Amino acid sequence: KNIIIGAMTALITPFKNGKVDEQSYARLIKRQIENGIDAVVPVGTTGESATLTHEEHRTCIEIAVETCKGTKVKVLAGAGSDATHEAVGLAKFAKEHGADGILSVAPYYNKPTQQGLYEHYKAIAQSVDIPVLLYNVPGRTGCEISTDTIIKLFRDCENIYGVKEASGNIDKCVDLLAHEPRMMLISGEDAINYPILSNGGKGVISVTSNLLPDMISALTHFALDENYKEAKKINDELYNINKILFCESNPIPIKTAMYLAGLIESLEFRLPLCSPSKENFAKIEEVMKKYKIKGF
Template identity: 65%
Template sequence: MLSGAMSALITPFKNNKIDEQTYIRLIERQIKYGMQACVPVGTTGESATLSHKEHMQCIEIAVCTCKNKGVKVLAGAGSNCTQEAIELAQFAQKCGADAILCVSPYYNKPTQEGLYQHYKAVANSVEIPLMLYNVPGRTGVNIEPQTAIRLFKDIENIFAIKEANGHMDTIVELNTHAQDLLIFSGDDAINYPILANGGKGVISVTGNLLPDKISKLTEYALYGKLTESKAINNELYDINRVLFCESNPIPIKAAMFIAGLLDTLEYRLPLLQPSRENMRLIENTLQNYEVLK
């Protein structure tokens, strides 16, 4: 079963097309610095502005790059249309992904029963494990703990939740009432607190830039070395904060470009490059960190 450190991968573009060679190189860098899994086409991967063909292309690249290297692929397969989510999940399974990450339906704001039925339909359409993804700040709907627990208890292949609602009481409630549900941090600022309260891993934005630090932070926490894990979490405070000075993934792609990890700095509209002020802020913050190539 999936656990440990993983990054929500950015999607590099060149001339408004997916830069396949850079994508492969970035995934290989994740493997080199100790990440247990890669997560293509989530929020950080600009999935909302990729075509279905591009979405599938990213999953295929990740699966092929990670094959036989001991690194799993947790493929983004979410939509606000249940049938689209099913199609993406089935493609990910066919392609060889180890599990799928399914974001809660955005924009249409379903009820909790609607969320339950959506996830039930997606999970039942595949045999591979499904991780719930709760990020109400982006989707406009919160997967309430009772709904997550109900899904976990009722549906065999729902095994985990990526929590990014920012509330530690949610983590405590989930741990209390569904102790076998695996909880993953979806908020870099509180990676350590979530791990120290029973979390089984992190799905990190910062990990795109500093996979060595995120993998060590997670490893220390999971092996009970909480003092060492907390020290890294504290060390990363400034960069974690600046990487959300504008909407994700605007700052992380800028930081990677400044650090020389990207040849081009491209986004899909409606996302744009950071403001001059925030670009300077990112540059100044990066001076305090060693970015390994």
Template identity: 65%
Template sequence: MSSMICGAMTALITPFRNGELDEATYADLIRRQIAHGMDAVVPVGTTGESATLSHDEHKRCIEIAVEVCRDSGVKVIAGAGSNATHEAIDIARHAQECGAHAILSVAPYYNKPSQEGLYQHYKAIAEAIEIPVMLYNVPGRTSVDIQPATVFRLFDEVENIYAIKEATGSMERAVDLLAARPELCLVSGDDAIDYPLLANGAKGVISVTANLLPDLKSKLVHTALAGDLAASKAINDSLYPINKAMFVESNPIPVKAAMYLAGLLPTLEYRLPLVPPSAENMKKIEAAIQNYTIPGVK
């Protein structure tokens, strides 16, 4: 579709202070993404701890992202998923009303719908709004896999479903999807394999590591999309140690710790049941970030 949003995109963290949403820090973090070449930001996805936010907090995060990105050229793809279709529709409508450019909708978690249930779920969400919809397939978290046949059916039959964030970790899945639907906007959801997916025809990434290193992540994507695969691979290879460190515990535990250690967050806070990394893993994260120049750190 003509409004396809792709490229270098960041799965934003959600900062807290004294247990509350830290709106000022959140806005500053988004401005930093804009300043370092990202094409879009993705508030309140997995990395944004959406599972522990209230609906009001979730909606406020989307509003702040839209406000900060206004007139910057950077797009907002709002996290708008739920395991209850009516709740996903409510968030999606709010995202549209406040000016988000698209939504990212995770597969319904916990209740394990069938493929027909997935089709009906996404069809209902997409038909409730006019802005573009990106599917988000992450079976390791949701316990349900949006199978290729269902992706094709949604892409073919629902006008504003244009993309999928593919986070199975499977290269074969990416080949399968793009071999059958090369016009599908497939987006990498696994930092470690961004380059191979881009080389295979992915049109962008939604990155955890970009919270820390937006300059390198944007360059990785833009060089690949411009056809300079050797330069993109070199950046991807150089990022492997930090990408690995960002997943020593469940995301977003390590990336928030890394940003705190780098001076990008004034406090290190999570919402239970998430807690800070173990002392051993904190040392691994601290060691990993020493090898990179973190942009925007005074």
């Protein structure tokens, strides 16, 4: 299978006066490239995929593709939807506009059955010829792609090569790689990046790497090179920031931290997301002081 693995960043989407700040978006991607990241994910959950229009979503994918061209950094485009026809349209767009692969979150809200999830992802994978990474995040979607469904999709659909797991369930990570060791398990939960990698996971799609791309990329590369002592050392050092970035729903804390570090111009969200509480604003700012934050 063709694969996209390694240290990857779920890019925040900066806004200016209610619109996507496209110059800021490209500048932040260049900063990821300069700090060892292997791939970027435009317009995942961290990118406020829910509140972008379909046109803005496509613009962000195009910016990522253009900014990474000529570098060895890949674009794994966010393309998920709770409607299969919408996810297929996003998948086809990402393929036609030069993305290296797509990330596709399990349908939120409408709670498909396992049979429905299988048919959903099969429709997506058959619509393109680029790699497709499944994405399980039951705390947000209300459904879980079971281990059996993931493995069947991996074995039945050429392009489906692994899953981004954001479920806090290391038992399921063992289950997945014990029964299908050929798939690419990707960590979608920063605090447990190292445990997922040490069990044979092959990358991360990180929120924290927006702020600390050098540290997340180093953790991942230490682990892939089997230097577990050094990978665990960074995972341990990052625990405090990894947890504080979820003190309110992602991406409210990471955007707050990016603003506090001077990496984006304005702390702007699209409703229903909004600024953190004053208390959480202070906690994020306090935790950040312990870390060296790279500039541009």
